[PDB]
Symmetry: C3
Subunit: 52 residues, 3 copies
């Protein structure tokens, strides 16, 4: 059925673009962890400049 088949492939589309966004979300969540882990280093270097 034309319309029945349409909506499904319309959905395969929508779902594909969703995988896409996870991909990059997973990606920049992971950049954020790294950005802040580096911040702890800096902060820890500070603390071991006071009580040294």
């Amino acid at each position: 059925s034309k319309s029945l088949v349409d909506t499904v492939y319309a959905l395969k589309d929508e779902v594909q673009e969703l995988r896409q966004d996870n991909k990059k979300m997973k990606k920049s969540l992971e950049e954020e962890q790294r950005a802040r882990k580096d911040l702890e280093k800096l902060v820890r270097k500070v603390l071991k400049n006071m009580n040294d």
Copy 2:
């Protein structure tokens, strides 16, 4: 087909609520970046209070 058509629209539902969650996830990931970028400022102000 009743059940065949049901599951598809059942899926259109499920997929719509997924776009929704990306939306807000994208959203609070973005709030987190900002929250921590502000933290670097603070930390950097600290470092340029020691070696000034």
Copy 3:
């Protein structure tokens, strides 16, 4: 229809594994907030060691 029915359940699969990933993404986004909120504490303790 065999193939028509296949792609739909093929899609129910794909969509289920997507909910899964949100679940854990929501999860580690939330771990990240906590990890950095703790960092502010540390940083704030620093600032209230200088101007005390």
